[PDB]
């Protein structure tokens, strides 16, 4: 948020600065140092399957996605611990043709046995947010059901 | 790069202080981490059925101050509910949300420096089928480096560094030392002493350097099932000097407790 | 309803912080209630006749910070003057005033949540008929829940919990146990022992659970007016075993101090 | 004059709060002086040869908050460097600057009230010819008046006030008393007692008032080189009453340790 004289917490004007306690206008914090760290993959309605293209950061460190509910608790997580940095991990949660494959160059590797089976509790994603574990970039395509249209 | 905050801004644009910057500041002042809170009930919370209403309760979680004004939270029947303060900075309209949970799901997420949702338990509500039975609040941890205090009042207990050592003095003597706060030591006598004279040193092992006192401590003991006693001299160099009656080949059981100061 | 204070305002209007909200925030950090203060004399106050001039003193009362810069308080002669900081928020232009009173009239009024004048004593100034004879500051109380600290320097005294127990051990033996910090116990022997044998359990009351040690403790005692001694074992189950010589019908006085650790 | 700060300005001019005014407040809340700091490493500082880069370290020096974000400090080859935080308020653009010095040059200059540059050490860096060997941070002192706490955990040591006394009880008996925290006293027996009967008060000096107990303390001692024992009753009036066997003209060496509580 923008910095305003009298409204924001700053020691301005006459030395050695001054911030006044008013009623309603008083002092409101401008923002946060390094606000670029905050990112939210918002989930507003219940989704049933997805096709994510995950680009990993560090090798040998579990890389993938984790899902949190409305109270900040993890319910499921698709995460993989590979030996080398994959160019991308192509994941499809579709039941009919489930795919968990890693790509390096022109070579396709099945990443299913390397995956953490304990964290992946459900496929059904609930209302909340999604976090990126050891990922530099991610591209998601979400498919959500409607009974009558 | 140095980011200054509690300083004068000439053109009223110089040192803008953010909520995370003040958040980090407030944490360091009280001495708290992302796993503990600062909670105060200005007015006692009301319990109606399987619900708990916080009439007026202020909470400082992760250095962020917020007030609960008549905020009611639903509870689970016949269960131990762990009330959590949930902070999500991405939810710019309403960052703080409350939740009654099955277990203490405190994460300790660094919201001020990094991303994520911070969860921290502050109250433990025990319920029945109808309403609330008992309420126990979470402890407020004050992590500090050094204290220069005049007076102190403790309602519970103080945990001091405890060190234990078992020295086989010799001639049939065993000493069980228990050093607390690196000062007070209570020595327990064990075994059965045989073949020793008055004023003579002990044949076996010597007392280790951390358990050695500043001056020669005369520790009194007793012979089990008798009306005769003894005393040993633990010299500052670690040596143990016998000062009881002369003991012949027959071994007599030695028991007793003797306390001394190191400093 | 939840009120959010230490959070960013996207349109610079969402989260305004009031003086009472910061007052409550500052109290919770330092661990102060409405019956104490935070006080610092940056420069020494000056006494002139029956007056005290606070040259440069900072005070925090009810989480509210204010400075006393060349502020003189008139005193009563040949009296003990209790100097109070009085906060009345309805007095918009001058909310703080100082008074010299005949008694400590601290009222603990919650000025951040409700109405009323907060009165808090911070100094005690004793006078003669002509001027100040002595000054004593009021103690600054830091109320905390739990402390994890490396080292501490105490100039006064630490008050730890104390529990006492009198045990009629049997055979005429009496133990008076004093436990401090729920750990260190000093046993004082009383009474007179008769009709007991070595290795035999004493015929009376066992030691109560809060005084029972983790391991067997041998405590040396002495027979009054004699050159003879005994010892007893306080077993972890609470039972007491006699380890002196066998005693006949005639009672012998038992005295002495013995120490042990419960933990 | 009274300068009010945590209050309202209805005309938006009445009570303005500056950097020094808040700086003084923060110091009082945490209990720090101009010689100590509040430091927290959110991410460990990197060491590249004779240089130290502070990735993310927040510091509160003289009540003034600042963050070090990837700030590198130049180091001296094969020397014990002292990293100082230098605050010069005259430098409106850059008040805080860092320096690695030969010795600890903490000045403790009052910047919030008076003029000057505040220098304070926070980290000690031991280096070799190539790079950093070891790092030790300066202790964060928390000066407090009184603490009302529930539970405490000490990793180092508590320094309680110690008092020594050497009272010549008489008849040839010497006592070495050591009182810590005005409660626990360990009496050390010395000398050689002669010409005394059972239940008779000892001829020499009486126990001083700060060492006198609340009740009569029975303390057991031992005769060096023998299997005979004794006990002395230290009554609340300071009088030492002998309670061993009747001793003639020949003096026998008395040694032993006895613990008792005053309170």
Has residue C210 been placed in a domain?
yes
| Statement to judge: residues D59 and D28 lie in one domain | yes
Rounded to a whole number of angstroms, the distance from the CA of C96 to the nearest CA of chain D is 7
| Statement to judge: residues D129 and D217 lie in one domain | no
CA C220, C225, C230 angle in degrees (round to 5)? 20
Judge: A20–D10 Cβ closer than 8 Å, yes or no: no
Q: In B, which residues are within 8 Å of C152 by CB distance? A: 146-149
**How far is the C-alpha of B240 from the C-alpha of B234, rounded, in Å?**
5
**How far is the C-alpha of B64 from the C-alpha of B76, rounded, in Å?**
28
CB-defined contacts B:C, below 8 A: 198
| Statement to judge: residues D81 and D165 lie in one domain | no
CB-CB contact of A10 with B9 (8 Å): yes
Q: Write the DSSP assignment of chain B as a string of letters.
A: -EEE-SSB-TTS-S-PPPHHHHHHHHHHHHT--TT-EEEEEEEPPEEETTEEEEEEEEEEETTEEEEEEEEEEE--TTSEEEEEEEEETT-SS--EEEEEESS-------TTTS-SEEEEEEEEEEE-SSSEEEEEEPP-EEEEEEEEEEEEEESS-EE--EEEEEEEEETTEEEEEEEETTTEEEEEEEEEE-SB-TTPBPSSPPPPGGG--SS-EEEEEEETTSS-EEEEEE-TTS-EEE-S--B-SS-EEEEEEEEEE--
Query: What is the domain count for chain D?
Result: 2
Q: Write the DSSP assignment of chain D as a string of letters.
A: -EEE-SSB-TTS-S-EE-HHHHHHHHHHHHT--SS-EEEEEEEPPEE-SSEEEESEEEEEETTEEEEESSEEEE--TTSEEEEEEEEETT-SS--EEEEEESS-------TTTS-SEEEEEEEEEEE-SSSEEEEEEPP-EEEEEEEEEEEEEESS-EE--EEEEEEEEETTEEEEEEEETTTEEEEEEEEEE-SB-TTPBPSSPPPPGGG--SS-EEEEEEETTSS-EEEEEE-TTS-EEE-S--B-SS-EEEEEEEEEE--
| Statement to judge: residues C121 and C51 lie in one domain | yes
Query: The tokens of B87 are what?
Result: 């902070």
Look at residues B106, B138, B170 and tell me which one is the last residue of a structural domain. B138
**How far is the C-alpha of C154 from the C-alpha of C145, rounded, in Å?**
19
Q: In C, which residues are within 8 Å of B71 by CB distance? A: 1-2
Judge: D158–B155 Cβ closer than 8 Å, yes or no: no
Of B5, B139, B258, the CB nearest to D66: B5
Q: In A, which residues are within 8 Å of D14 by CB distance? A: 20
Of B7, B20, B90, the CB nearest to A33: B20
| Statement to judge: residues C134 and C25 lie in one domain | yes
Has residue B6 been placed in a domain?
no
Has residue C5 been placed in a domain?
no
| Statement to judge: residues D124 and D23 lie in one domain | yes
Has residue C1 been placed in a domain?
no
CA A133, A136, A141 angle in degrees (round to 5)? 80
Has residue D109 been placed in a domain?
yes
Residue to mutate among C3, C12, C19, with most A CBs inside 10 A, is: C12
Of B43, B154, B229, the CB nearest to C220: B229
Residue to mutate among D66, D98, D186, with most B CBs inside 10 A, is: D66
Q: In D, which residues are within 8 Å of C84 by CB distance? A: none
State the angle between helix axes of C19-30 and D19-30 in degrees (0 to 180), rounded to the nearest 10.
Answer: 30
Of C58, C151, C226, the CB nearest to D24: C58
Q: Could you tell me the residue range of the domain that residue D206 belongs to?
A: 161-263
Q: Which residues pair with C40 in a beta bridge?
A: C58
CATH of the domain at C122: 2.60.520.10
Which chains form contacts with chain B, at 3 or more CB pairs under 8 Å?
Answer: A, C, D
Of the candidates D112, D105, D137, the residue with the CA atom closest to the CA atom of residue D33 = D112
Residue to mutate among A1, A3, A29, with most B CBs inside 10 A, is: A29
**How far is the C-alpha of B12 from the C-alpha of B4, rounded, in Å?**
14
Residue to mutate among B20, B152, B185, B186, with most C CBs inside 10 A, is: B152
| Statement to judge: residues C62 and C171 lie in one domain | no
Preceding peptide of C159 cis, ω within 30°: no
Strands B117-127 and B96-101, sheet pairing: unpaired
Breaks in chain B after residues (C–N exceeding 2.5 Å): none
Judge: C30–D27 Cβ closer than 8 Å, yes or no: no
**How far is the C-alpha of B187 from the C-alpha of B231, rounded, in Å?**
12
| Statement to judge: residues B114 and B182 lie in one domain | no
Of C38, C42, C148, the CB nearest to D153: C148
| Statement to judge: residues B127 and B197 lie in one domain | no
Has residue B155 been placed in a domain?
no
Judge: B149–D147 Cβ closer than 8 Å, yes or no: yes
Query: The tokens of C30 are what?
Result: 């330092």
Q: In C, which residues are within 8 Å of A26 by CB distance? A: 16-18
What chain C residue is nearest to D2 in terms of C-alpha separation?
A: C68
Query: The tokens of C83 are what?
Result: 């100097």
CATH of the domain at B185: 2.60.40.1830
Has residue C144 been placed in a domain?
no
SS3 of C178, please? strand
Rounded to a whole number of angstroms, the distance from the CA of D68 to the nearest CA of chain C is 22
CB-defined contacts A:C, below 8 A: 38
In order of B32, B90, B118, B178, C220, the CA distances from B188 in angstroms are 41, 61, 50, 9, 11
Judge: C113–B42 Cβ closer than 8 Å, yes or no: yes
Which residues of chain C are at the A interface, by a Cβ-Cβ cutoff of 8 Å? 6-19, 22
**Resolution, Å (one decimal):** 5.5
| Statement to judge: residues B131 and B174 lie in one domain | no
Q: In B, which residues are within 8 Å of C29 by CB distance? A: 26, 29-30, 38, 60
Residue to mutate among D4, D11, D12, with most A CBs inside 10 A, is: D12
Tell me which method was used to determine the 3D structure: X-ray
Look at residues B123, B138, B153 and tell me which one is the last residue of a structural domain. B138
CB-CB contact of C75 with C119 (8 Å): no
State the angle between helix axes of C19-30 and B19-30 in degrees (0 to 180), rounded to the nearest 10.
Answer: 40
Has residue B1 been placed in a domain?
no
CB-CB contact of B149 with D147 (8 Å): yes
| Statement to judge: residues B181 and B259 lie in one domain | yes
What chain A residue is nearest to C20 in terms of C-alpha separation?
A: A21
| Statement to judge: residues D134 and D166 lie in one domain | no
* Sheet of strand B132-137: strand arrangement: B96-101, B80-88, B117-127, B132-137
Judge: C24–B153 Cβ closer than 8 Å, yes or no: no
Judge: C24–B42 Cβ closer than 8 Å, yes or no: yes
Judge: A12–B18 Cβ closer than 8 Å, yes or no: no
Query: The tokens of B101 are what?
Result: 């949970």
* Residue B236 main-chain phi, psi, to 5 deg: -60, -20
Which chains form contacts with chain D, at 3 or more CB pairs under 8 Å?
Answer: A, B, C
Q: How many residues comprise chain C?
A: 263
Q: In B, which residues are within 8 Å of C183 by CB distance? A: 157, 180
Look at residues D103, D138, D173 and tell me which one is the last residue of a structural domain. D138
């Amino acid at each position: 948020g923008k910095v305003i004289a009298g409204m924001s917490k700053i020691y301005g004007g006459t030395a050695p600065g001054n911030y006044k306690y008013i009623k309603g206008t008083s002092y409101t914090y401008y923002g946060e140092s390094d606000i670029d760290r905050l990112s939210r993959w918002d989930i507003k309605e219940e989704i049933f399957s997805f096709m994510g293209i995950l680009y990993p950061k560090l090798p040998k460190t579990p890389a993938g996605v984790r899902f949190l509910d409305d109270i900040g608790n993890e319910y499921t997580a698709i995460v993989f611990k590979t030996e080398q940095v994959q160019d991308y991990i192509l994941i499809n949660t579709d039941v009919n043709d489930e795919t968990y494959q890693g790509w390096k160059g022109t070579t396709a590797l099945n990443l299913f046995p390397v995956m953490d089976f304990e964290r992946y509790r459900t496929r059904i994603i609930e209302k909340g947010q999604m976090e990126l574990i050891n990922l530099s970039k991610a591209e998601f395509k979400i498919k959500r059901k409607a009974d009558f249209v | 790069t140095i980011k200054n905050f509690t300083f004068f801004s000439p053109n009223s644009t110089e040192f803008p202080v953010g909520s995370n910057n003040d958040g980090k500041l407030y944490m360091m002042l009280t001495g708290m981490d992302y796993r503990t809170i600062r909670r105060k009930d200005w007015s006692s919370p009301l319990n109606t059925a399987l619900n708990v209403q916080y009439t007026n309760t202020s909470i400082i979680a992760g250095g962020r101050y917020f007030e609960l004004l008549n905020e009611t939270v639903a509870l689970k029947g016949d269960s131990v509910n762990y009330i959590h303060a949930n902070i999500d900075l991405t939810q710019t309209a309403n960052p703080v949300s409350l939740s009654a949970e099955t277990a203490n799901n405190s994460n300790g997420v660094d919201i001020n420096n990094g991303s994520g949702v911070l969860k921290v338990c502050f109250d433990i509500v025990t319920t029945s089928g109808t309403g609330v039975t008992s309420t126990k609040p979470i402890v407020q941890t004050s992590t500090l480096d050094s204290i220069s205090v005049n007076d102190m009042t403790v309602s519970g207990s103080i945990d001091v560094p405890v060190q234990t050592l078992t020295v086989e003095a010799g001639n049939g003597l065993q000493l069980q030392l228990t050093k607390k706060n690196n000062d007070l030591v209570i020595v327990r006598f064990f075994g059965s002493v045989s073949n020793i004279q008055k004023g003579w040193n002990m044949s076996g092992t010597w007392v280790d350097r951390p358990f050695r006192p500043a001056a020669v401590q005369s520790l009194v003991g007793h012979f089990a099932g008798r009306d005769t006693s003894f005393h040993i001299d633990i010299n500052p160099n670690g040596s143990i000097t016998w000062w009881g009656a002369n003991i012949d080949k027959t071994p007599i059981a030695t028991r007793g407790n003797g306390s001394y100061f190191i400093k």
